[PDB]
Every structure is written in structure tokens, then in C-alpha cells.
Amino acid sequence: VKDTYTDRLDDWNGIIAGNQYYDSKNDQMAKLNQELEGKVADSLSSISSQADRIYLWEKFSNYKTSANLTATYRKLEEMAKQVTNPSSRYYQDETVVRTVRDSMEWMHKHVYNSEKSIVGNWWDYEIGTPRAINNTLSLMKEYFSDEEIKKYTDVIEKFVPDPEHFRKTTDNPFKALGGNLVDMGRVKVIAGLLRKDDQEISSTIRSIEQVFKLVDQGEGFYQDGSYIDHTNVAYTGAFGNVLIDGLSQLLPVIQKTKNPIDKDKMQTMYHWIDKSFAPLLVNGELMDMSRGRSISRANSEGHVAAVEVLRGIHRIADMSEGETKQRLQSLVKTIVQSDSYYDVFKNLKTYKDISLMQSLLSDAGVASVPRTSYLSAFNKMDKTAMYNAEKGFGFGLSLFSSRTLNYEHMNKENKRGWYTSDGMFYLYNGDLSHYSDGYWPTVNPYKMPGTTETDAKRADSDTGKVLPSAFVGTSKLDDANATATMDFTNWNQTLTAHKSWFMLKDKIAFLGSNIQNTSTDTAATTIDQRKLESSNPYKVYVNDKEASLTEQEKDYPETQSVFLESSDSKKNIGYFFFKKSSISMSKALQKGAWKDINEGQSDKEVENEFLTISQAHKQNGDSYGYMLIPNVDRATFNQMIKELESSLIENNETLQSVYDAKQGVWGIVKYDDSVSTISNQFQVLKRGVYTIRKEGDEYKIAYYNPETQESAPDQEVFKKL
Ligand SMILES: CC(=O)N[C@@H]1[C@@H](O[C@@H]2O[C@H](C(=O)O)[C@@H](O[C@@H]3O[C@H](CO)[C@@H](O)[C@H](O[C@@H]4O[C@H](C(=O)O)[C@@H](O[C@@H]5O[C@H](CO)[C@@H](O)[C@H](O[C@@H]6O[C@H](C(=O)O)[C@H](O)[C@H](O)[C@H]6O)[C@H]5NC(C)=O)[C@H](O)[C@H]4O)[C@H]3NC(C)=O)[C@H](O)[C@H]2O)[C@H](O)[C@@H](CO)O[C@H]1O
User: Is 138 helix (H, G, I), strand (E, B) or coil?
Assistant: First the structure.
């Protein structure tokens, strides 16, 4: 017979497989089931047989590569899903049942058991493999005896005995937090259920509860929405995904155990969704600046990664109720519906998830209204996300400081993300596929957009660094206006620049001063490197005069503006140079392979066309200043830049400021404590970042000191003249 433990595992199966929700007449479900049918068949026809072999599958033979461990167990899990799916051609198949039971025994005797030691990555020994095993056993529990289950999970207890720590069999174990902490639950809570071990369950759950705390230091979610992981990396979009994705699968089960989690304790979850996740999603795309090294993975481009968060959010809404359930549903609905590029079902991998998404999209009772404008200053992870609902464009500012790592290159992934945080900017417009379709393996890693750098060669073997300066941060006035700055110094301290950004509702001014180079390499700022669509060509205008770009760089001296004109106004990009400047442009096909940036990816060649614009800085004390104006047609652009003829208030080594006359808003960055009189109306007195709005004879002030990470009383930083 059985019990409440199996009852929980039954619940878990419906969440992880959802065989009980399958419907052959359901288009989406049938498609996933067909995908699983093909996998099992491939696995079944390639599995080695006769006289105990040296590998189950030739592709994952080398048992010294921990990867081959969980990839092998995942193949049995797939078999477990189909074998328990009444609509599968493998339903209760004697061969498939024996193959799983045999493969478990073989692997246990020769590759993964209690007498072994972590060989390769610990993750596979404590997370990857134990999960695949728990799932396989949970699904086929009616084919395995309890003795066999215990026997097969003992090794999991060996490698992961402590619900609070990972790598417990090593010399350098670590306290499980965030995503890892959630993975700890999918490992020990399930194993606990399978082993009918209450202690394991309660302790692991008690341990999981730690995930609900907001932090003000270290890894985790901060009150400002930032999410830090791997000590000091902005990671909402990769580890955050795993956290929400995994937690949402677990909660329903945990909540039905002897130790359910208090409602109040789970409160923060909605804080993550609203403050941390939502702002990073633009037209179904999860901003790459928050995905760490995941960006180097071919099967995880922006829209795909976003579904990871969305399915988690949807699962949460589903266990919620009333308003909370309602608004979360609308949130998922509208995001999914705004995505005209990626089919959300391509990354919904269980029948329950597919089913939930179908009823949501078809339920007219659930409002799907375009999201309104917002600007999130994630100062605790040095990132800034901006979105204009009226004009429909998104903007992401990627930086780092003494508090954060610039880029993550680990496990051979993201070998060339060197400059992706050196003041790199992201523009999300009509082209929802911009940062997809092989953008990453084809983008020139030496000219990330918005970054100022020398052309020195870089080594793939390099790893991240924190920034010398702490003067990096964003002062947000409201949902449409904010100012940011970065006291920049390049990787080898040969170049510096005071880089500042002024987000003014429907445009962003880029200012750079104090540019210095002590090296022999050339210094230049990449104004942009935009990925083109062969289907939607741009007509390039320089100073409102058609220009023909070539692979070979062309120089445009005395350039006052550049305009990228598409047939779709929502894909237009204009650049107004406050002062006539010398720039270079070129359009060229850029080839590459994912393997180039991620050892474990395919070496198949990829290619994309890119339009590159940059400004060389040949002298010390150089600078740049331009306004980025997207989503307006040519005639409107040409008109807008005439009005903007005097928006630049200043741009030197101590003061940088842009003024929006239409809005009555000022963006200001001060590098010293001198008294700065602005537009003869007011005086700003402290080193820091400001965003001020004049409303009549009144002034709205948004002041931020990025070093101390504090604001300050109005009279300390601002003086009305
Ligand atoms: C050098 C060193 O050791 N430094 C240490 C540092 O160690 C590093 O730690 C991290 C870390 O995780 O913290 C390690 O990072 C991870 O490495 C693995 C291995 O390469 C990556 O794969 C992983 O990226 C994630 O990988 C998953 C995976 O492939 O398993 C992705 O998985 C999918 O996620 C789904 C969401 O729930 C899940 O459902 C799915 O499984 C199926 O689910 C079904 C269902 O329920 O829906 C179903 O039914 C099924 O039965 C079930 O199989 C799961 N599987 C698949 C195949 O897709 C995940 O989406 C992806 O993001 C990577 N993590 C990240 C975030 O990138 C790193 O390798 C270690 O070296 C320590 O962490 C650090 C401590 O602070 O100290 C350093 O010194």
C-alpha cells in the first residue's frame, strides 16, 4: 500500500509532468508529447546493450565529466514521463520499464553511488543528477519498491546531507542561498518524500524559508528590486529564474506537507515579481544585462529565458487568490500577448503549464492591458531598466562598480562578455528579435554599444573584475526620468571616462567627459552596434542626407545627427550630437559560433548584419555627447533635434547636465562639491547624481550619492536662487 508521502509525490508528478492533464485533442499538449516521444525513441535506439558496456549512451560515456551524469539520468526521466502517459506509445511498455529499472541499477553500481566522490562539477552530484533521479523515481514509483527507492536515493543523502549547505563532502562547502537554496528543496524535499523521511522534509523546508528574506548585503533580493548572486553579480535573470521557477513548482507540494510555510513569510514573493522581475521583461523578453553568463547559451536567448520567469509567476498566481491572482494573471497575459516574436508554448514543458497558459489567454475575464511606463533604478546591482508605454520602447543601462562584478565568465561560458557592463546600453524596440537569432555569438565583443574602450586584444580566459570606483549609480525622479553616472576605468587602468546618462521620458542623453588614455591602443566609444533584419532594411541618414554604408568604415566629420529609418517607425533610431562630432559607421556581416563564447555550445556557424557607429577619442580630455531618440519618424526627429539645440547644459570633468525644456526636467551629475548654478534658476551643491523637475515656482528633487548609497536633505544638495 501507500501514504500521504505518495500523495505528495502524486502532486509533484502533476506539476513536473502533468500526464493527468494530457489531452490528445489539445494542439499544444500533443506537440510536447510528440517531442517527448521522439526523445525516448532516440534514447531507446541509441542506448548501448549486451554484456555490460562502458557507457549507457556513447554521447555521455565519459563518467569523469559530471555533465554526462545528469544528462544520462535526465534521459531516464524522459522515459519515466512517457511510460506513465496513457497516450504515449511507450505507456507501460515492458522494455521501457525494464530499461529504466536496469539503467538505474547499472548507473548506481558503476557511476553514481555513496562510495563515490565528486568528480568534475559538484552541481551535477548535488543538484542536476539528484533532481533527475528524484523525478524518475517519483514518476515510476509504482514500478519500484520502497527498498529500491531508498537504495537509489541513499547516494543523494551522501552528497547532500545538509539542507543548509552544498558541497558538504568537500573542503569548501557553502551556505545555500537563492536559486541554489530552491534547488536544495527540489533535491531534499522530494528525496524526503520518496524516503518517507519527515525530518528531512521539515529541516529542508525550514531551510527553504530563508529564501523569503530580503537582504541589504550579499546574495539575494534587495528592497530596491536588485538580485545578487555568485557573491556580487547582477543575476535576477538567470539565478532569479531558477529561484522563481523552482519555488513555484515546490510550494504546492510543501504547502500540503506537515510543515506548510506561513502566508506572511511568502509575502515577499510578490515583491520579487513586481520590483525585481516585471521591470526586466519587455515585450516578452528578459533583459540580458540580468542573465549573467546564460546569454552565451544558444537555447536560452531573451524571450526563451523570460518564459522561465513567466511560468513561475503564472504558477504563483494560480496558488494565489482574488486580486493578487487576478493582477498576476493580467501581468502574465499582457506580457505574453505583447510578444509577437516568440511563441510562449515553446518553453512550457509540462501539460499543466500548457493548460494553465491556454485558459489564461482565452479567459476574457482576465484583463490584458498594455503595461504602463516605468523606470527601475536597481542601484544594488548597478542596473537600470526603463520603459515608455506611449512610444513603446525599452532601455537598459548595464554597469558595475566596486560593489559588483562587470561580467561572469565561468565554466567556459561567456568567454567574451568583457565589456557588457562598461556602460553598455540596451534598446528594446519594434524588433523583438534584436538580441536573439544569434546576436551574442555574432556581435563584435570589442565594441559593445555605449562602451568606451581601447582596441587592445583581450583573452577569452580572462574573468570579471569589480570597478575601482564606487561612484556609480542612478537618481530616479519618477517613472519617466532618471539620471545615472559611472566613474569609469577600463580593465587595465589605461583609460578613464566620466560616463553619464540622462533618461528623459522619450529619449536618453549620453554624456562622456574626462576621457583619458595612457596606453598606445586607440580609444573610442561605440555609439551603437545594431543587429539588422534582412527583411526590414534601414535607410541611413547622416545630417538628414542619405548615406550608403559599407563593410569598410566610412568617416563622417561634422556630424550633427544620424538617423536609422525603417518602414516601421517603432524601429527608428536617431542620434543627435549636441556638438558636431567625428564619427565612423559601417554595415557588415559578422560571422561567429556559439562555441566561440561558450565551450559547451555548437560550433555551427552563425551570422548577422550589424550597423556600427563609433567616435574615436584621440586626445586626453576628450568627450562625447549625443541624444538617443527612438520610435519617431524622420520629419519628427529632425524637428525634435532643433528644439534640443540647447539641451546640453554642461559636459566637463566635474559637471554633466542636460535639460528638457518641454518637461522642465534637469539631469545633473556632479563629480565634486563645488557650487554649480544651473540655468540661472538653482544651485546644486553636492557631489552626486540629480534629477530635478520645476513645477511652477516649486522644484521636485531626486538626489543620490552613489558612493554612500544614500540620498540627502534637500537643503544639503539644492539651493533655489
Ligand atoms: C567553479 C565552481 O564550482 N564555482 C563555485 C560555484 O559553482 C557553480 O554553481 C552554479 C550554481 O548553480 O550555483 C553552477 O551553475 C549551473 O550549472 C549547471 C551545469 O552546467 C547548468 O545547467 C545551470 O543552468 C541551469 O541548468 C538546468 C539544468 O540544465 O538542469 C536548467 O534546467 C531545467 O530547469 C527547469 C526549471 O524547473 C526544470 O524543470 C528542468 O528539469 C525538468 O523539469 C520537469 C518539470 O518538472 O518541469 C520535468 O518534469 C523534469 O523531470 C525535469 O528534468 C531543468 N532541466 C533541463 C534539462 O532543462 C536551468 O534552467 C538553467 O538555468 C547553471 N545555473 C545557472 C543559473 O546558470 C555552476 O556550474 C557551478 O560551477 C558555487 O555556486 C559558488 C557558491 O556561491 O562558489 C563557487 O566557487
Answer: helix
- If we measure between CA atoms, which residue out of 523, 560, 559 comes closest to residue 447? 523
Domain pair 2-373 / 379-635, same fold? no
Helix (H/G/I), strand (E/B), else coil: 419 = coil
3-class DSSP string for 535-576? CCCCEEEECCEEECCCCCCEEEEEEEEEEEECCCHHHCEEEE
Write the CATH number of the domain with boundaries 2-373. Answer: 1.50.10.100
Distance 158 CA to ligand 1 centre (A): 20
Residue 287: other Cβ atoms inside 10 A: 24
Helices 146-159 & 129-139 angle (0-180, nearest 10): 170
Q: Residue 228: beta bridge partners?
A: 220, 234
Contact 66, 118 (CB under 8 A): yes
- The region that residue 198 occupies, defined by phi over 0 for left and psi between -120 and 50 for alpha, beta otherwise, is alpha
CA 290, 631, 451, 645 dihedral sign is negative
Q: How far apart are CA 563 and CA 715, in angstroms?
A: 42
Residues whose CB is less than 8 angstroms from the CB of residue 463 and which lie 6 or more positions away in sequence, other chains included: 409, 410
Contacts of 405 (CB under 8 A, 6+ apart): 230, 231, 232, 233, 464, 465, 466
Using H for helix, E for strand and C for coil, what is the string for 167-178?
Answer: CCCCCCCEECCH
In this structure, which residue's CA is closest to atom 48 in ligand 1? 16
Instruction: Name which residue sits closest to atom 27 of ligand 1, judged by CA.
Output: 128
75-78: long-range contacts (C-beta < 8 A, 24 or more apart)? 75/39, 75/43, 76/100, 76/103, 76/104, 76/132, 76/136, 77/132, 77/135, 77/136, 77/139, 78/36, 78/39, 78/40, 78/43
Backbone angle region of 484, left / alpha / beta, with phi > 0 → left and psi within -120 to 50 → alpha = beta
Distance 313 CA to ligand 1 centre (A): 19
Q: Which CATH architecture has domain 636-721?
A: Sandwich (2.60)
10 Å Cβ neighbour count for 10?
14
- Tell how far the Cα of 123 is from the centroid of ligand 1, in angstroms: 7
Q: Sketch the domain layout of the chain as residue ranges.
A: 2-373, 379-635, 636-721
DSSP 60-112: G--TTSHHHHHHHHHHHHHHHHHHT-TTSTTTT-HHHHHHHHHHHHHHHHHTS
SS3 673: coil
Q: What is the resolution of this structure in A?
A: 2.0
Three-state DSSP state, 346: helix
Q: Distance from the CA of 510 to the center of ligand 1, in angstroms?
A: 37
Angle at 455 between CA 451 and CA 458, to 5 degrees: 95
170 CB neighbour count, 10 Å cutoff: 14
CA distance 640 to 632: 9
Ligand 1 pocket, Cβ-based, cut-off 6 angstroms: 16-17, 74, 77, 121-123, 128, 132, 135, 174, 179-180, 230, 238-239, 242, 245-246, 249, 294, 349-350, 411
Q: How does DSSP classify residue 434?
A: T
Dihedral pair phi/psi, residue 452, rounded to 5°: -110, 125
* C-alpha to C-alpha distance for 187 and 137, rounded to whole angstroms: 12
Best substitution site from 43, 83, 118, 242 to test ligand 1's pocket, by max atoms within 8 Å of Cβ? 242
For 637, residues 6+ apart whose C-beta sits below 8 A from its C-beta are 561, 563, 572, 574, 629
Burial (CB < 10 A; 0-12, 13-18, 19+), residue 267, is exposed
Question: Residue 205's closest CA among 179, 229, 187, 221?
Answer: 187
Return the closest-CA partner of residue 476 out of 274, 701, 290: 701
Which of 11, 19, 410 best tests ligand 1's pocket when mutated (most atoms within 8 Å of CB)? 410
Q: Minimal CA–CA distance to 509: which of 474, 541, 484?
A: 484
| 379-635 belongs to CATH 2.70.98.10 | yes
Between CA 694 and CA 702, with CA 700 as vertex, the angle to 5 degrees is 125
Report how far residue 35's alpha carbon sits from residue 364's, in angstroms, rounded to the nearest whole number. 30
